[PDB]
Each structure stands twice: as C-alpha cells, then as structure tokens.
Design a protein around this nucleic acid. Sequence first.
RNA 1: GGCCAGCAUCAGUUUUGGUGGCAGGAUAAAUCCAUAGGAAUGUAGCUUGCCUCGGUAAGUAUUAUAGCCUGUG
RNA 2: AGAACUGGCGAUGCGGGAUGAACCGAACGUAGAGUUAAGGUGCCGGAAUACACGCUCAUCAGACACCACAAAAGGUGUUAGUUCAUCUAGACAGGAAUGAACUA
RNA 3: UUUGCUCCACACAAUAUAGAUGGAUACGAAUAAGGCGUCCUUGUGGCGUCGCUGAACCAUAGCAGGCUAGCAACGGUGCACUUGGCGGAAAGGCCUUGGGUGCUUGCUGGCGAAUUGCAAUGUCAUUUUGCGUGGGGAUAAAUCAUUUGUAUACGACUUAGA
Lengths: 188, 171, 106, 134, 96, 197
Amino acid sequence: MKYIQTEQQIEVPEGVTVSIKSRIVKVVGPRGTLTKNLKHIDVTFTKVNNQLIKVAVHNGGRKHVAALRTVKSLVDNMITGVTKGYKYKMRYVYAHFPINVNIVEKDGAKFIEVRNFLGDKKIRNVPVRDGVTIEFSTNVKDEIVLSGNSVEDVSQNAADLQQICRVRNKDIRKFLDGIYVSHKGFIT
Amino acid sequence: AHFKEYQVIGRRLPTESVPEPKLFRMRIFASNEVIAKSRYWYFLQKLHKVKKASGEIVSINQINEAHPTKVKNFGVWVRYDSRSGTHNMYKEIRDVSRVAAVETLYQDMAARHRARFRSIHILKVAEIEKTADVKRQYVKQFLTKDLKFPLPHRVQKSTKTFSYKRPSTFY
Amino acid sequence: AESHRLYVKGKHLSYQRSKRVNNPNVSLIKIEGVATPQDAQFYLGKRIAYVYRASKEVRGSKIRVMWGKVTRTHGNSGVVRATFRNNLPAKTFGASVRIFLYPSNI
Amino acid sequence: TDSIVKASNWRLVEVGRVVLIKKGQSAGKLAAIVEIIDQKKVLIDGPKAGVPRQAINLGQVVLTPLTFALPRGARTATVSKKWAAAAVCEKWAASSWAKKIAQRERRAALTDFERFQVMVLRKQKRYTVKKALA
Amino acid sequence: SHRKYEAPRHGHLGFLPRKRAASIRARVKAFPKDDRSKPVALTSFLGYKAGMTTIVRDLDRPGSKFHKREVVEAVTVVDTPPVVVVGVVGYVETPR
Amino acid sequence: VEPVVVIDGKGHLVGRLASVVAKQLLNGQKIVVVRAEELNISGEFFRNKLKYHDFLRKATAFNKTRGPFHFRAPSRIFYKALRGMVSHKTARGKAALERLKVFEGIPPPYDKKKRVVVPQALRVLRLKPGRKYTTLGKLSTSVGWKYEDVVAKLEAKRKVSSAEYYAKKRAFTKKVASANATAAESDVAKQLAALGY
RNA sequence: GGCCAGCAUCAGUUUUGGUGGCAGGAUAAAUCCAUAGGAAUGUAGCUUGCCUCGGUAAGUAUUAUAGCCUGUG
RNA sequence: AGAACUGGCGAUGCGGGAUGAACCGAACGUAGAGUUAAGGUGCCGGAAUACACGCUCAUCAGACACCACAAAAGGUGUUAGUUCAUCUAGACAGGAAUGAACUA
RNA sequence: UUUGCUCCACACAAUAUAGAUGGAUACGAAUAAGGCGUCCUUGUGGCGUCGCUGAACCAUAGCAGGCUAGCAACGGUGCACUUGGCGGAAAGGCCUUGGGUGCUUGCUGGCGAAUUGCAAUGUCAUUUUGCGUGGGGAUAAAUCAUUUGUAUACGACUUAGA
Ligand SMILES: [Cl-]
Ligand SMILES: [Cl-]
Ligand SMILES: [Mg+2]
Ligand SMILES: [Mg+2]
Ligand SMILES: [Mg+2]
Ligand SMILES: [Mg+2]
C-alpha cells in the first residue's frame, strides 16, 4: 500500500570494514574480501556508526519491500563469509558399486572426477569454482568437504556435484545412490 | 465533478386533511443545485410514499466547511452495487473538507471496484475526532510524530524537444 | 554587422485539413520561438513572404515572392493559420518562410 | 580503517520546509509546509508573499534547501512570527538559485538602447581578459 | 486434403538457386581460424585436376572384418606445380 | 535550431524517440542518430525476443525474397520503427526519410561534434523505477547481428581519444575562468552586473 | 484610367486580451481580534535509569521559555 | 423462417465507426467567414507526449457501442472490503500485531 | 573518327535547388546519484560549491558596412605560405611552429550618405554542365569478325591469334 518508510539494520563486527558506494558493496575481513553489485533494487544505505549500517526503502509497495529484507540477508552473509567462512559437507551413498571421487588437473583448471557411479564407464567432471577448496575428511568414510568465503560459490559448487550424479530410467526411490549435502555450517 | 454539499428540505403537498405536513431534510453532495434536487427525490422515494409530483422543495442551501484549512480524518460509510450483489463498505480518507474527501471517495471506488456514480450511495461522512479511532493502516502511518520523507527520483518537465546535457534526478 | 535579418523564421507545415480532406486555401505555419497561443497573438496580422528561386529572369530578377499574412492561432502549441494571395504549393511542406514585423503596434 | 558509506542529501517533506510555487496564481513565491496530508498533498501557507493558506499537490511546488522551526498545524499568525524570526527571505535572497531568477528577470527588462550598451561593455571587458590570457 | 502417403522431399533446399557459377574458379568463402603462436604458412593451394586411378593398401582399423587386410580404393590426382607470390593485401575490421 | 542535430541514442526508449524524430524530419530538420546499439525497449529481454521471432516467421509463402525483410542490426531496427510512422510511399515521405542517418557507434564524421538528447524519450525519465527493460545491442546479437564486438572495440578506442581531449579542455577552461574572476571588481564588470550580464 | 498593392477613418459579421462599477449567500465560510473550556502525535518545568560531563528512554505536568483544538461574540 | 409499432435502406450523397446499403451525427443550389455534431488530439494525422486520483507486469497483457466471440471452475499474484476469534492481563513464528471463513 | 584527354587559376553563358540568411558550441559514466574546485596518507578519501534547463555560451556597432588623423597596448582576427605531430569505422579532419600582409569598435577625432521619393526578397547563397583563355601532366583498351569445348537452346561462359 506504498508504505512510507521501511527499515532494516545490518551489524558489523570489530575487524570488518564495509565500503558502499553507488550500490556497490565491498566487505573486507580477516579471511579475505568480497564484492557484490546491487544496482537492481533501488535501496538507500546509510551509516549510523562503525558497528551499524541501515538500509531503507521509501514509498515502496509489497513487492519492493520484500526485496529490502533480501538485501540485509545478502550483506550479512558476506560479513560472516569473511569472518567465519562456510563449510559444506557431503556424503557418498551407494548400494553395490563404490563411488571413487578424486581431484584432477586438466590444463590448469582443477576439476574433480567421479568414477564408477552405478557401474557407469562414463567419467563425470565437475569444475571447481574460484575461492572454493575441496578436501576429503579423515576418520569419516565417504565424505567430501567444500569450504570458501562466498556462501553462493560453495553452495552452487556442492549443488553441481549433487546434480551430476542423478539416476536415469530407474526408480529413484529404490536406487538411492548419489552424493548429497549432509551439513551446512561455518569453517570456524 | 467538483462536488458541493447542499441541504435540501422538502414536504408533501399540503391538503385540507393534513395542513402543514412534516419537513424532511438531507445533505446531498452534487456539482450543482439541479442535480441536488434530483438526488433528493431519489432517496426520498426510497423512504416515504411521496414523489416530485405530490411534493415540493422548501429550501436548498449550500453548506460550507467550518474550518476549510484544517487537516481532518474522515470515516465514510458507503453502499454500492457490484456486478453481482450489493455490499456495505467502510473507508477512511484524510483531507481538509468534506467535499474534498467525497471527491476522493468516488475516485477510489471507480479505480478499485469499477463502481460508477449511479451505483454508489453515501451513507454517512463523519470526522474522526480522536486518534487511535483510525482503524486503517494506510491512514495511521501519516499520524506519527515528526513525520519526514524524501521524494527520490525527481523528473523535470522540459519545454524544448532537445536538451544539450544529460539530466539529473537529484532532489 | 554579420546579421541583417529583420524577420522571424518560420516553417510551412501543411494545409488546413481533416483526417482525409485538406483545404489548400489555409496554410498552417510554425513560428520559431512560439509555443503558446497567448504568445502567438503577437504575430496576428503580420505579413508573411515565401521566397524562392527560378532559372528564368522576368522583371530583372531571378527571385520570386508569394505574399500572405497571419489570420489566427491554431491549437495549443503556438501554431498559427495563414492565408496567401496565391495558395502555397504543396511541395513547400517543410520549407522556410519569413514573418515580418510590419504592420507594427509597438 | 573505518566503514565508508555515501550519504544521500535529499530535501525532506516536513513541517517548516520552505517550498517555491511554480504553477498557479502564486508562482514564483515562497511558502512553508504546515502539515502533511498524504504522500502527494501538503498544507502550505506563506503570509509574507501573500500566499493564502491552502492544500496543494506536491507536483505544483519545488522543495528548497531552507528549513525553519515551526509547530505542526500552526495558524497563519504563528507562521508569520516564525518566518520573520528565522529570516527566511534574507537567506533565500543570498542563495545562487534566487540570484539566477533575479538575473533572468533583469535581462528580459532591458531596452534596445541598454542592449547596445551591453555589447559595448562586453567588448571592452573582452579586450582586457584576452590580454591577460596571452 | 492431406497427401495419401508420406515421402521425403526431393532435393536439397540449401543448394539453391541451381544457377551457373559466377566464375569458373570457385570462391573460398572461409579460412581456418588463425593461431598467432605458429609460424607463418599458407592456408590453401591451387592445382589442376588430372584424373583418377586405383591404389591398394592395408587397412589399419581394429575391430573391422578387413583389419590388417588389403583393400582397393579409388583416388584422384591433382597436378600442383609451385605457385608464385606477386603481392599482398591488408584488411581492416569495420562495422560493415 | 542547428542545421544538423545529432542525437545520442543511449538511454532512449525506441518508440518514443522514433515519434520525435519522425515529426522533426517531416517539418524539415536533418537528424543524425548515433550509438543505436545502446537503445532501450521497455519490457524484459525474453518478451522482446519472442516478439521478434513472431516477426521472423512472417514471409511471402511462394517466394521468401518477396516477403518482409527482417533486418538484424540495431540501427535498422530503429529505422523500421521510424519508417512505420512516416508515409514512406509518397514523395513527401521519401524526401523526409533522406534527412535522417542512423549509425551504430559514433563514426569519425560525428565523433568531434556535439550530441544532444531527447528528454521525452529518455528511459531514466519515463519508466517507473524497478520496471524491466532490454538493450537493443544484445537483442540484435541474439537474432543474428554479427558486429557487436567490432563496435565495442572501436567505441573503446574512441573514448580514450575523447577523454584525452576533455582533459585539455578542462585545463583551458580553468585558466579562462580564473581570468574572468580576476577581471571582476572593475568598473566595466560592475556596469555589466547592473544590466544582468 | 486599365492591373496590383499600402495607410487612415467608418459600416456588417466574428475572434482574442486589459480594465471599472454593482448584486446575492450563514448579508459567503475562513484568516485576524476578544473571550470561556478542553485535549495530545504533550511545549516549558520537575522526577526517575543507564549513560565519552548532555543527548536520549518514560512518569508527572494542560501554557509556562512552543503551539493546537472546540464553543460563543 | 414468420408477425406487431416506429424509424431507416431501397431512392442518399456528406462528417465519424480503418474498411461496410441499414449503426452514430447530419440530410445536399453556387461561394466567403465564424461556430459545432458524432468522433478524436504520441507518429502516420488536423488537435494537450494536458492536468488529477487510483488499478494492472501477463515466456500468447490490454486498448471503445452495432462488431467481427469465450464459459463453468481455480491462484498465499496484487488491491480493497465483510464477519468472527486471539492479543496492552506478551498472541502468532522460532516485542506488535496475529489466525480463520468469505466478497469483487 | 581531322589536336583529342586530364589537373589548376578566372572568363563568359546555360542549368537547378525537399529550401543558408551570426555559430551543428565534441569526455565518460551514474540517475535510491553526479559535475566542478581544492587538500592529502591517492581512496568506493576530506572540505567547499553548483543544479531546479540553451531564458545559456560565443559572436554581435562602421556605404551587406566607405575614406582619413591620433592615443593606449604587442593583444584579437581574416587570407595566402611554412614547421612538426596526430587521426583508417565512412580517416579527407584536428592540433601546433615561424614570418609576411590586411582589419581592429580597447579609447579619442575629422569627412561621405539624400532622390529606391511613405512598403514591395528588393537580388549579396551552392548544384551541375558547356564554350573560349594559358600554366602543368599522361601517350590505352574493349567489342564485332576469326578460333577453342573445361561451356552452351539463343545470348552468355571459357581459350588462342601481329
Ligand atoms: Cl531440403
Ligand atoms: Cl556459344
Ligand atoms: Mg543469415
Ligand atoms: Mg428496385
Ligand atoms: Mg471497425
Ligand atoms: Mg499534428
């Protein structure tokens, strides 16, 4: 109904500095730096102090106001990405054929290969996005860990690995074989 | 059109059995007196056994706003006919005069419910004297202390076809 | 100086017309700098000349003139109606005309 | 290191905000916002410029940087006292915006003889300026 | 009404019109993509068709019935004396 | 007022700009349009791509070379929108269309001239904020325009030269502005101030 | 005195401005002035609690170091 | 296909509905000037890219009587409204409003 | 095929105008943001200032703009040369060095104008071509006919011949 003013608050830790200009957001923390372009929402950022930043929408409808809370979540994710980081864990699930997962290098591109998925002779390759590191956890059988500063880069990288191992022409309720995300958390 | 509020007073034609019949008054929003008298007989024929041929108009007077430069909160009760059925509706309008609030009411009904003038009956227009009696959120948001708001993205009207610099929307 | 102009520049837009029928006896004239019917009242009655060139020389000259005057305003955008002694040719739609300062009321 | 966020400097619709009327019978005059009716309508009143107390659409006026203290819904007599105390007219006249308005009116009031003098004076000043350039 | 039975169309519509070529020497309308990190070399050559003949060779194709067995194939011979360079031309990229 | 008006097409809505230019040509004003690849159309990219494919399927059945011609370049797309607003089958319409030139990028003849804008057709001044729009350059590429990268490379070269010219112009303007301010406080300056100049 | 025009003073028709004097209404309603009363989106003052020595937060307080609303004249 | 009353076409041009015997406006000697009807005023196209309050985003939006088509039934898309219940004595989700059923 | 062809300067005619009548006056990018100035530790930096339209800026006085004298400055501007650099998207333009010469209304003077008779575009632009002047520059091909068959209904195509 064209609300006069809607407001959200963003908190900043001690070691994190935020620079916003022309809807370009750069967050610098102990773990690195992140940059995001937000020139598609028409919001107004204002600084209260070194520990608080407010973002507001003026004369906005229901749909416009709904995007204001999204901005806060995206900026908050950047802040914790450069402070605590993100760690995604996945597990290998299979019935008969073991799944062999290894990291390979192809023309300096840092791919990851999946072998012997349901006995397939085909080799499945998934690119590893920049800023995402892949390690194989010890003392836990068939687990792969993805870490990085950007939650979107880590989440999408893990999602690509899950979709590359989908079963075709079979009852998926019976053939529960694949690699699935099992835990979402922070590196620290 | 630009509405004016008239008071119209009417009566039945006096006879030998009942000399001096009762006087009936009602307040009508209309653009002129000719329409105001027409609307008077329209509502009187819905309430009493009388019509224009068997009655007469006693007096018609325009009513002005007592304080036309004071911001007031109005509560309006209306009855209107939609494409299927008749409904009652309560709306709240903020303005400086009754005629101004009624003009907004007709525009609002046409825009949101496609209701023309002929399909609307104004049951009552009353000023809301006290705060916290306003029950619509689209009116209450203007009743906060020290209200301030900017006007982002100003658009300026140009009198010439061509401009020699890129324009700015600052304000 | 470098300028000797004593007239106001104008353009011949079209004839008076409806959607399908035109009237050559009246021409619509756009005056540069005029964008309001109130401002166009200043130019009512002013003489208008259309100047063009011909190959054949007749009265010791190769320049010919068609004379007219401003009659009334037209629309809300400062256009005016004009009548000429001989109707302007249709090929001059978009050509330049000269609007003089006489007769003067200043 | 400190956080850096650019801050907007919008003119706010508020009580005591000075506006300039561009359309109507009070065009070119100053007035003060007394109360806010809705997102697009405000109540204005300028007694010094002879602007009657009225409700007007926000598209008929232009907000100005000037602002003075004024209680909400103040009557015409109160507005006059606050307006004179804050010296709104003096502050407006000193702005570059008002001087541009005054210059525009002055040029339109020049006669043909005065325009000739402007050409002569401009040529004399041009000679001095171009000499300093070289 | 619809045709009684279906059948593929006669001829290819991508080789139209079936008109005479503008010149007896066919134009080269495309060249291989340039790789700047290689030595300068020509991309085509000119010759004259002389005729056809037959050759015999062994087939090196594992999994085929005729693997490591002789096959008879037809070939075409093109007479290609050396060409002579007599000029150079430079081209500039343009929106047209 | 200028003998030739050069319009920078960047940030202009195609339909509203086309109406303005068509009336200017019919009134007898020569118009040059540059940077046609930066034109905007209201609506999402997918909507306008679907509209062009509807235009593509229209063709004369018995001979495709007779049917409507589907020009893919951004300049010719704007030309199509403009020819529809002019009676192009008359001699008057033909003469008006010869007063117009449309280019992708800013060719050398007009890169050292002044470019104007049309506020009535500007996207930033017309469309409601938050509304989705499409750029004519990317739309043309999807329907078979081949010279998007060539224009981009040339425009980058033009801006480097144009920026260098502006730096020298800024330096000279600072020198001129100081002298005018220094020339103030004189009797001639005071007399000019009294007359408005 | 044949052809084509310019200006002035008038007549008929018409179009577009500037300006003066009157009449009516709740003998406009307001604004403004005087006066009685009242309230909060509560001004001054006072109190309370954290507080980078005074800026907040909520209690009291109806004109005071701001004002507003209603009736009547 | 067949009747009743009236107005029309046929026997009729003219302005408007792109186009049309019947619809809308208006009926016709030859000309000039002024004003309008129905219909219109982004460009084609004569005339405000006028003013004002709202509504609508559609990967098959919509756009004007006669007229050149769309329904039953649905949507936590969005807007306004009706009734009932909870909530200042702290509800809903996991410190301010919330839940349910309906209307267009 | 009777001294033809081409370039440059002007000479006289003819031809035509989709329409000169002070000047098309060059950053880029953003628009819920920018321009300019200024300072520094050169940044998504501090401070100041501007907008609310080109209603600007530049130009602009003299027989469509004459003939002369002087004063202050060593500037501004036109034309023809000259120096160096840059520009290929349709560059055919922009910038710069040096001297010559004309004008200068930056300031002060002295002469001329009439009669076009009270207005009549009152003729001051650039398009193309032709004929005569003289100052340089250059001395070929195609087609038919004949011939070939990688071609072919006829044209056309492809070859050969001092
Ligand atoms: Cl085919
Ligand atoms: Cl042959
Ligand atoms: Mg193609
Ligand atoms: Mg018959
Ligand atoms: Mg139709
Ligand atoms: Mg028009």
